[PDB]
Structures are given as structure tokens and as C-alpha cells.
Amino acid sequence: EKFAFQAEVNRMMKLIINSLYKNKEIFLRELISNASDALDKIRLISLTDENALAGNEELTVKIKCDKEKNLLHVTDTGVGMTREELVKNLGTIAKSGTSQSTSELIGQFGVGFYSAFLVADKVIVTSKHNNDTQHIWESDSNEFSVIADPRGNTLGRGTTITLVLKEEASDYLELDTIKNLVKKYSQFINFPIYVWSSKTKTVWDWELMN
Numbered sequence: 001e002k003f004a005f006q007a008e009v010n011r012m013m014k015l016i017i018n019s020l021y022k023n024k025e026i027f028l029r030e031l032i033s034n035a036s037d038a039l040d041k042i043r044l045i046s047l048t049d050e051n052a053l054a055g056n057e058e059l060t061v062k063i064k065c066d067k068e069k070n071l072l073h074v075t076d077t078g079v080g081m082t083r084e085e086l087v088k089n090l091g092t093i094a095k096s097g098t099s100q101s102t103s104e105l106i107g108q109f110g111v112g113f114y115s116a117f118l119v120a121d122k123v124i125v126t127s128k129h130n131n132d133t134q135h136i137w138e139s140d141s142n143e144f145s146v147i148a149d150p151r152g153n154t155l156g157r158g159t160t161i162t163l164v165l166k167e168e169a170s171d172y173l174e175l176d177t178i179k180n181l182v183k184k185y186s187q188f189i190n191f192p193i194y195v196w197s198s199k200t201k202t203v204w205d206w207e208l209m210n
């Protein structure tokens with residue numbers, strides 16, 4: 001009743017996504033692919049301005065697990081997003097407590113966003129664009145809320161996708177499962193992709209997978 005349109009969009013996107021790919025791991029491929037497109041965008045801007053990477057001279061994809069908090073982080077130093085981009089997000093999500101340009105948004109980012117809800121219950125976006133403030137955005141595919149980050153500009157430039165995982169999909173947080181999965185969907189990415197892994201007396205560091 002409250003979110004009839006949102007639930008129907010969620011039902012249709014899940015139905016079509018599950019039918020087309022049949023592999024629930026498509027969420028990780030989208031996270032890798034979308035991060036690559038953001039990195040490619042800012043690298044293209046670099047070829048015309050000398051100091052377009054001043055906020056962050058690296059162009060990486062860094063994936064980190066949090067088995068205790070049940071979190072999955074995929075951080076890239078791509079182009080990032082302004083606050084107005086986060087407000088539009090995909091046009092199908094209503095602003096919190098308030099109950100085509102959006103159809104073109106679903107075309108480009110619908111599969112990437114709604115596939116995350118095959119393994120997650122909430123998606124949190126932390127982004128920083130060159131000409132704007134760092135913001136935190138969250139949604140449950142029904143409502144959304146955007147916030148100015150109290151930590152300030154900690155990303156320098158780029159985006160962090162945080163998925164709070166379902167209890168059924170807690171296996172994606174182990175090291176050997178997330179490392180083998182990233183390796184599969186990385187042979188077509190022209191950017192280094194690191195995974196926070198442990199080495200042995202045990203220290204943690206960025207391990208590059210491609």
C-alpha cells in the first residue's frame with residue numbers, strides 16, 4: 001500500500017534480472033563494472049586537464065569485507081557523484097517520508113542497483129565529486145535519504161558502495177569466496193582491483209586480483 005509503485009519496480013527488476021543471468025553473483029559483476037565506468041570517466045577527463053586528479057591521484061577499486069557488521073564495501077576513486085546526482089539516483093525511489101527522465105536512469109543503472117537487492121537489504125552510497133561536497137546516500141529500494149558527510153572529504157574523489165547483506169548471503173563475506181569471485185569478473189577491467197585480504201602473525205593489506 002505505502003510503496004506499491006516501488007515494490008512493483010523491485011518485483012519486475014528482480015524477475016527480469018533473475019531470468020537474464022540466473023546467477024545471483026551478478027551483483028558483484030555490476031559493482032565491478034560500474035566502478036570501472038566511473039574510473040574510465042575520470043581518466044578520460046584527465047587527458048585534457050592536467051590536475052583533474054588532485055583530490056586523489058590513484059585510480060583503483062578496493063573491496064573490503066566486514067563479517068562482524070555484515071557489510072560489503074566496494075570503493076573506487078572514479079568520477080564520483082554530486083549531491084544532485086544522488087537525489088535523482090534512479091528516479092524510481094521516493095524521498096523518505098513523501099508518501100521519462102527516470103526510465104532513462106533505469107536503463108543505464110537499473111540492473112546494477114536492483115541486482116544488489118538479491119543479496120542485500122540496504123545499499124549505502126558514499127561519493128565525492130570534484131566540484132561538490134562528500135555525501136552519504138542510503139536506500140532500501142523503497143525510500144532514500146541523502147546526508148552531508150560529517151567526516152568531510154575523506155574519499156578525496158570517488159564512490160563507496162556499501163551493501164548490508166542478508167543473513168542468507170553471509171557467505172559472500174569470507175575471504176576465499178570473495179577473492180575467487182572478484183578474480184572471475186575482473187579479466188575485462190583496465191583498472192587494478194584490490195581485496196582486503198590477510199597474509200601470514202597475520203597482517204592485512206590490499207591484495208591485487210587482476
Ligand SMILES: COC(=O)c1c(O)cc(O)c(Cl)c1CCc1nccn1Cc1ccccc1
Pocket residue numbers: 030031034035038039076078079080081085086088089090109112113125137158159161
Ligand atoms: C549502484 O552503484 C552504482 O551505480 C555506482 C557504482 O556501483 C560505482 C560508482 O562509482 C558509481 Cl558513480 C555508481 C553510481 C552510478 C551512477 N551515476 C549516475 C547515476 N548513477 C546510479 C546511481 C545509483 C545509486 C545512487 C545514485 C546513482
